[PDB]
Write an enzyme that holds these catalytic residues in place. Structure first.
Site, PDB file in Angstrom:
ATOM      1  NE  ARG A  24    -118.576  93.466 -65.553  1.00 57.07           N
ATOM      2  CZ  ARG A  24    -119.452  92.799 -64.817  1.00 57.07           C
ATOM      3  NH1 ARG A  24    -119.127  92.354 -63.611  1.00 57.07           N
ATOM      4  NH2 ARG A  24    -120.658  92.560 -65.296  1.00 57.07           N
ATOM      5  CG  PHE A  33    -114.573  99.861 -61.446  1.00 57.49           C
ATOM      6  CD1 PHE A  33    -114.504  99.758 -60.068  1.00 57.49           C
ATOM      7  CD2 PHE A  33    -115.649  99.274 -62.088  1.00 57.49           C
ATOM      8  CE1 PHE A  33    -115.494  99.081 -59.356  1.00 57.49           C
ATOM      9  CE2 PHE A  33    -116.625  98.592 -61.377  1.00 57.49           C
ATOM     10  CZ  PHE A  33    -116.552  98.507 -60.007  1.00 57.49           C
ATOM     11  CD  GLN A  43    -116.158  90.634 -62.232  1.00 60.07           C
ATOM     12  OE1 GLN A  43    -116.466  91.765 -62.583  1.00 60.07           O
ATOM     13  NE2 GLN A  43    -117.070  89.710 -61.937  1.00 60.07           N
ATOM     14  CG  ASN A  98    -121.483  90.020 -54.297  1.00 57.36           C
ATOM     15  OD1 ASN A  98    -122.377  90.630 -54.885  1.00 57.36           O
ATOM     16  ND2 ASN A  98    -120.815  90.539 -53.273  1.00 57.36           N
ATOM     17  CG  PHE A 111    -113.333  93.070 -57.801  1.00 58.91           C
ATOM     18  CD1 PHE A 111    -114.344  92.360 -57.161  1.00 58.91           C
ATOM     19  CD2 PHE A 111    -113.052  94.368 -57.353  1.00 58.91           C
ATOM     20  CE1 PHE A 111    -115.053  92.911 -56.107  1.00 58.91           C
ATOM     21  CE2 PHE A 111    -113.767  94.934 -56.297  1.00 58.91           C
ATOM     22  CZ  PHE A 111    -114.770  94.202 -55.678  1.00 58.91           C
ATOM     23  CG  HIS A 165    -118.401  93.517 -53.836  1.00 65.37           C
ATOM     24  ND1 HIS A 165    -118.609  92.515 -54.754  1.00 65.37           N
ATOM     25  CD2 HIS A 165    -119.284  94.498 -54.143  1.00 65.37           C
ATOM     26  CE1 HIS A 165    -119.572  92.880 -55.590  1.00 65.37           C
ATOM     27  NE2 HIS A 165    -119.994  94.086 -55.249  1.00 65.37           N
TER      28      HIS A 165
HETATM   29  C1  LIG Z   1    -124.177  94.061 -58.364  1.00 63.93           C
HETATM   30  S1  LIG Z   1    -124.105  94.208 -60.026  1.00 63.93           S
HETATM   31  C2  LIG Z   1    -123.083  92.749 -60.013  1.00 63.93           C
HETATM   32  C3  LIG Z   1    -121.761  92.999 -59.300  1.00 63.93           C
HETATM   33  C4  LIG Z   1    -120.685  92.291 -60.144  1.00 63.93           C
HETATM   34  N1  LIG Z   1    -121.154  90.966 -60.311  1.00 63.93           N
HETATM   35  C5  LIG Z   1    -120.817  90.152 -61.147  1.00 63.93           C
HETATM   36  O1  LIG Z   1    -120.028  90.357 -62.034  1.00 63.93           O
HETATM   37  N2  LIG Z   1    -121.581  89.072 -60.845  1.00 63.93           N
HETATM   38  C6  LIG Z   1    -121.656  87.819 -61.390  1.00 63.93           C
HETATM   39  C7  LIG Z   1    -121.309  86.807 -60.413  1.00 63.93           C
HETATM   40  C8  LIG Z   1    -120.298  87.006 -59.483  1.00 63.93           C
HETATM   41  C9  LIG Z   1    -119.967  86.008 -58.622  1.00 63.93           C
HETATM   42  C10 LIG Z   1    -120.625  84.812 -58.592  1.00 63.93           C
HETATM   43  N3  LIG Z   1    -120.286  83.848 -57.706  1.00 63.93           N
HETATM   44  C11 LIG Z   1    -121.638  84.595 -59.542  1.00 63.93           C
HETATM   45  C12 LIG Z   1    -121.927  85.588 -60.442  1.00 63.93           C
HETATM   46  C13 LIG Z   1    -119.421  92.255 -59.289  1.00 63.93           C
HETATM   47  O2  LIG Z   1    -119.246  91.400 -58.445  1.00 63.93           O
HETATM   48  N4  LIG Z   1    -118.524  93.237 -59.473  1.00 63.93           N
HETATM   49  C14 LIG Z   1    -117.280  93.248 -58.698  1.00 63.93           C
HETATM   50  C15 LIG Z   1    -116.524  94.510 -59.211  1.00 63.93           C
HETATM   51  C16 LIG Z   1    -117.020  94.581 -60.650  1.00 63.93           C
HETATM   52  C17 LIG Z   1    -118.538  94.288 -60.569  1.00 63.93           C
HETATM   53  C18 LIG Z   1    -119.296  95.489 -60.277  1.00 63.93           C
HETATM   54  C19 LIG Z   1    -119.661  95.815 -58.988  1.00 63.93           C
HETATM   55  C20 LIG Z   1    -120.323  96.944 -58.682  1.00 63.93           C
HETATM   56  C21 LIG Z   1    -120.685  97.805 -59.683  1.00 63.93           C
HETATM   57  C22 LIG Z   1    -120.357  97.541 -60.988  1.00 63.93           C
HETATM   58  C23 LIG Z   1    -119.647  96.397 -61.291  1.00 63.93           C
HETATM   59  S2  LIG Z   1    -119.240  95.977 -62.933  1.00 63.93           S
HETATM   60  C24 LIG Z   1    -119.925  97.227 -63.917  1.00 63.93           C
END
Ligand SMILES: CSCC[C@H](NC(=O)NCc1ccc(N)cc1)C(=O)N1CCC[C@@H]1c1ccccc1SC
Length: 164
Positions: A54, A59, A62, A101, A112, A125
């Protein structure tokens, strides 16, 4: 002192170069140790061969889902998930290294690298390091992302490890 680790990254099989990361073990020892060991592969699994799945311009980039390669998986050296260690370090600007997470206390292996200040992630985070060298490589990775996060090239961590 704090560990220095590296990721060597390819795009469509062509090397982009090396990203060197300082892990702030002085602040977040458990989170730093997980990432360090996943870079060396010393537990028998880790980041080698896995992808940046991703990437969103202006931004972050990841990676780290070395089990499902799509953002649903990964695992830590402790077990499948581990707690948020603290939120002491902040998402201050480009080059910050932070844990992805699925809500509170769901750190695994996904991580990321920020390409801008992402202050809205503070307290959500766990930040655990920063880019020492190779922001040019990070900007190349970023340029292969899109608003949806889908990458336009296959971005692979071909090698990784510990420098000190
Ligand atoms: C709160 S919406 C989910 C947040 C997203 N999460 C994932 O991609 N989660 C799947 C996941 C991550 C870690 C583990 N151990 C298991 C599943 C995440 O961690 N991030 C880190 C920066 C990119 C992404 C994110 C965070 C906040 C807002 C948007 C985004 S991506 C559009």
């Amino acid at each position: 002192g704090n560990p220095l680790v590296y990721l060597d990254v390819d795009a469509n099989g062509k090397p982009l170069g090396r990203v060197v990361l300082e892990l702030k073990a002085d602040v977040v020892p458990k989170t730093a140790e997980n990432f360090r060991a996943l870079c060396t592969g010393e537990k028998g699994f880790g980041y080698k061969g896995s992808t940046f799945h991703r990437v969103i311009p202006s931004f972050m980039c990841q990676a780290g889902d070395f089990t499902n390669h799509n953002g649903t998986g990964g695992k830590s050296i402790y077990g499948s998930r581990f707690p948020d260690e603290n939120f002491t370090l902040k998402h201050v600007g480009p080059g910050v290294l932070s844990m992805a997470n699925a809500g509170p206390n769901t750190n695994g292996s996904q991580f990321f690298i920020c390409t801008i200040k992402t202050d809205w992630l503070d307290g959500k985070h766990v930040v655990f390091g920063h880019v020492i060298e190779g922001m040019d490589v990070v900007k190349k990775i970023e340029s292969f992302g899109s608003k949806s996060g889908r990458t336009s090239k296959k971005i692979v961590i071909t090698d990784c490890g510990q420098l000190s």
